[PDB]
Amino acid sequence: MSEKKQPVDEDNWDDDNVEDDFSNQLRAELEKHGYKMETS
Amino acid sequence: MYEQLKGEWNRKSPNLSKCGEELGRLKLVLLELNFLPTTGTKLTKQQLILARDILEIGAQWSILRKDIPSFERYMAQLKCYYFDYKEQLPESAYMHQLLGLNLLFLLSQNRVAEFHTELERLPAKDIQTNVYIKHPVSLEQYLMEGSYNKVFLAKGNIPAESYTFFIDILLDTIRDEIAGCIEKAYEKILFTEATRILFFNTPKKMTDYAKKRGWVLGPNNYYSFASQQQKPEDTTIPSTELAKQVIEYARQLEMIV
Amino acid sequence: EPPPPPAPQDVEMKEEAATGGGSTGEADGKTAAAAAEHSQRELDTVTLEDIKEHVKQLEKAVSGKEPRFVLRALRMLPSTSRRLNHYVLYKAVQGFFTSNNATRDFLLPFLEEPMDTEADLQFRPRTGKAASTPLLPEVEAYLQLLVVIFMMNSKRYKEAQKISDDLMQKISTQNRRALDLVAAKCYYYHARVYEFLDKLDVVRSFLHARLRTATLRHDADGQATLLNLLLRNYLHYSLYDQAEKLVSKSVFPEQANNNEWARYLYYTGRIKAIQLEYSEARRTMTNALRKAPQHTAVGFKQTVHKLLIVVELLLGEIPDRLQFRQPSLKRSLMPYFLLTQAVRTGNLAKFNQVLDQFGEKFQADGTYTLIIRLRHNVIKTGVRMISLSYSRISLADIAQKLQLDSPEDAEFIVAKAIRDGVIEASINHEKGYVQSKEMIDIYSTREPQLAFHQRISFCLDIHNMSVKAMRFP
Amino acid sequence: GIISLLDEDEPQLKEFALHKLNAVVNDFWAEISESVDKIEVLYEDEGFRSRQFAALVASKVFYHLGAFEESLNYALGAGDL
């Protein structure tokens, strides 16, 4: 055999793909896009 | 061995002369070796190489006469000639586009597990070489997404004129899907869209499809009506038969004490 | 060293003491086809042998068990247990006596020594143990040069244990099944000897011929161990043999070790990956995924999950996979975190940047049929997300918002979406309206009360599995 | 595949092909299961010589599948071979 080389050397696993979009993008999302109503 | 039976290599079959010579001559191969469940000294495999080439011309004669079971049967022979347990064979000039033939008609006959063991019996060489392998599988990506947009454009690119014969079978599996995917799944299409996708703009072929749906055409229109009637309900039949299932559920109360 | 002598003297005699001394009670336990209480214990300690010290990992003096135990392989009047106790006292040939090494040189007449000595009195686990345990714990030397045929010769005397197994003792041995356990393991060593440089051409018709002698008459676990071999060699070896199963599909009467049944359903579900039977594959590969929880901390569960979830990505939809994050997985980037990120996005440039950028690891995938409908899974994920979001959507929105260049291309994608039953859309083909809509009657009028024969058919199946489970004591 | 090849009216192709059958029978147990009807026709063809051998390897392949009783009836109607 089972080893042959290797003995010498509701959680996040659920969310990480949408939480990637909660990891790089849209930090102040409706707080600049929420500011589109009055800044524009 | 028989130095060259192919003395008319560019004069393959205007007749059935070398075809009958091919029946007697393949019959001579059958009398000689048999086939390849032979270890061989590679010199008895030399007429197996010539046997590969004359079964390539036997395939071209089988599509010349339109013998499809002997066509894919000789093609199955050629798949047994590359399934031949000695890979160490000389290289025939048709070695990849015979898999293009098998890929194309095997694509047109709607055998998709055969398409995947086609992509699996010799996977690694299907990517780079033979644009007649890369082009029917990217064309399979075109049948997957972007259909009815690249068929005749793809027909504009076959310089090795043996693939039009089976992309006409792909035209048949186009026309039945026009005969299932523009009417009786929508509301109404006008005459000009059936003119575009149903080519030659009024045969008795697009008429044959409009009447093949079981519907009578209007002027300058094809309604897709008269479908999905009565709002079916199955009134009390599951209330009968599912408690008929509860009967042998009480048998499951019976076998257990 | 002084610490190298005492340890194999201890654990080695603890192995054959319970092995021979307990298997004596097993075959003298005249009906023991399921007890085998030191057979499977012994194989549990042989999986421990491959981790730990072997028969003699050339343990720094002479590697002397091999010129010790297979000499006088004879189970006579019970002073031959004192011959093995002489083989306890002679373990100081390394320590006290003249050190004489006989590994790889005299091991072939040592393989002749179960035949050179007297009659084996019907305890073949010691002799086939002497046909496996010399050289298969020498696979770990990894030179595989002229000792391929030596380890193979030890499997030829194992084939002599097949001759003495199913060609001798014609009255209900029931050690035949334990020798199918040991025989199957050294068939995996036929893989670990043949398949390093060749293919198991003997065990093609001897795969089916050991299956022939292990078909119905005394078959137990040879069915799906030889079918694990049948299923596992014939994936790297060319296919259609899984269609050679399809005319003669025979699976276990009762499931084996849950590791074996787990990995077996992983193998045949991994065939249904390339067979593209997406319905059964998600539940038998889910079953196979959850059913093997024991693995080495650097992986093989990430191998089983990695090569598991590819067609699950190709279902058209997928959940966000498993639920137990692994960082050595994160170092190896095996099941493509970034590519399934490109799946749940409707992205194409970074998507084909993952495709083109990582193709040396797509070699480690070896399943390039993923991309040919996985770009299609990007566009069907887009139309499934937007169509699932909006009550009505039109080709003016989606057909060029997703840059399909034309109305009719989106009408072809919705043609394949209604063809797949995904959306209840409609298209007015007059002005360019996708006059899409959402169907009604989501209530529990009919559909869950129809589903409760699947829920409760499931429940009565677990009732009867609990009853049949109760039938054992 | 090599069993589908047998549309030639000369039976010596079928004896060549049974010479292939006992040769590469050690890998191809599946194809005769789709070629049962060919073993039925070539078995029920009287003057065709290979009906007895069709009962032989039909007893082999139905032995392989599990039709040991049709292997038995073919073993009856398989002759001295």
**Whether D69 contacts chain C with CB within 8 A:** no
The residue of chain D with its CA nearest to that of B78 is D1
- Rounded to the nearest angstrom, the minimum Cα separation between B8 and chain D is 25
User: What is the radius of gyration, based on Cα positions, of chain B?
Assistant: 27
| Backbone dihedral region for residue B220 (phi beyond 0: left; psi -120 to 50: alpha; all else: beta) | left
CB atoms within 10 A of CB B189: 20
B35-64: string of b/e by CB count within 10 Å (b at 16+)? bbbeeeeeeebeebebbbbbbbbbbbbbbb
CA distance D34 to chain B (A): 15
Which spans in C28-80 are helix H? 39-51
Cα–Cα dist B49/B42, whole Å: 10
Which of B27, B37, B70 faces D20 most closely, judged by CB atoms?
B37
CB D28 within 8 A of CB C248: no
For residue A13, what is the nearest residue in chain C, using CA coordinates?
A: C323
Instruction: Assign B12 to helix, strand or coil.
Output: coil
**How is residue B55 written in tokens?**
């079964």
Distances (CA, A) of B195 to B183, B188, B189, B213, B222: 14, 14, 11, 16, 11
List the single residue in D with minimal CA-CA distance to C213: D64
CA distances, C179 to each of B34, C57, C113, C124, C218 (Å): 42, 25, 20, 8, 12
Tokens of D11: 């039976």
8 Å CB contact of B73 and D4: yes
Q: How many A×C Cβ pairs under 8 Å?
A: 38
The Cα diameter of chain A in Å comes to 68
Q: Which of C201, C205, C242, C244 to mutate to test the interface with D (most CBs of D within 10 A)?
A: C244
Assigned token pair, B85: 């347990």
User: DSSP secondary-structure letter at C284?
Assistant: H
Q: Which residue of A has its CA nearest to C338?
A: A17
Residues of B with CB under 8 A from a CB of C: 83, 112-113, 116-117, 119-121, 123, 127, 137, 140-141, 144-149, 181, 185-190, 193, 238, 242, 245, 249, 252, 256
Q: Which of B30, B77, B117 should one mutate to test binding to chain D, selecting the residue with the greatest count of D CBs within 10 A?
A: B30
* Under 8 Å between Cβ of C398 and C386: yes
Distance CA B157, CA B81 (A): 29
Q: How far apart are CA C358 and CA C107, in angstroms?
A: 48
Q: For residue B38, which of B91, B97, B4, B80 has the smallest C-alpha distance? A: B80
The experimental method behind these coordinates is cryo-EM
The Cα–Cα gap between C343 and C384 comes to: 12
**Cα C282 to Cα B231: distance, rounded to the nearest angstrom:** 34
From the CA of B167, how many Å to the nearest CA of chain C? Answer: 20
Q: Which of B176, B183, B179, B131 is nearest to B158 (CA)?
A: B131
Sign of CA dihedral C314, C315, C320, C323: negative
Q: Find the CB nearest D30 among C204, C205, C247.
A: C247
List of chain C residues whose C-beta atoms are within 8 Å of the C-beta of residue D27: 204-205
A residues 8-27 lying closer than 8 A (beta carbon) to C: 9-18, 20
The set of chains that have 3 or more CB pairs under 8 A with A is: C
Contact C227, C214 (CB under 8 A): no
Kindly list the partner chains of chain C, i.e. chains with 3 or more CB atom pairs below 8 Å.
A, B, D
The chains in contact with chain D, meaning 3 or more Cβ pairs closer than 8 Å, are B, C
Structure tokens at C424: 């209840």
Chain B nearest C-alpha distance from C233 (Å): 14
Structure tokens at C161: 């244990």
Nearest to C323 among A4, A6, A14 (CB): A14
Interface partners of B (3+ CB pairs, < 8 Å)? C, D
Contact C429 B127 (CB under 8 A): no
What type of residue sits at position C449?
Q
Q: Which of C204, C243, C248 sits opposite D27 (nearest CB)?
A: C204
**Which residue, chain included where needed, has tokens 């055998």?**
B111
CB contact under 8 A, D27 and C247: no
Q: Which residues of chain B are within 8 Å of residue D5 when distances are taken between CB atoms?
A: 73, 77
Inter-residue contact D63 to C208 (CB < 8 Å)? no
- Per DSSP, the three-state class of C428 is strand
Partner D, chain B 62-81, Cβ-Cβ below 8 Å: 69-70, 73, 76-77, 80
Cβ separation A3–C50 shorter than 8 A? yes
Q: What is the dihedral of CA C453, C458, C463, C468, to 10 degrees?
A: 130
Q: Determine the 3-state secondary structure of D37 from DSSP.
A: helix
Residue B75 burial (10 A CB sphere; 0-12, 13-18, 19+): buried
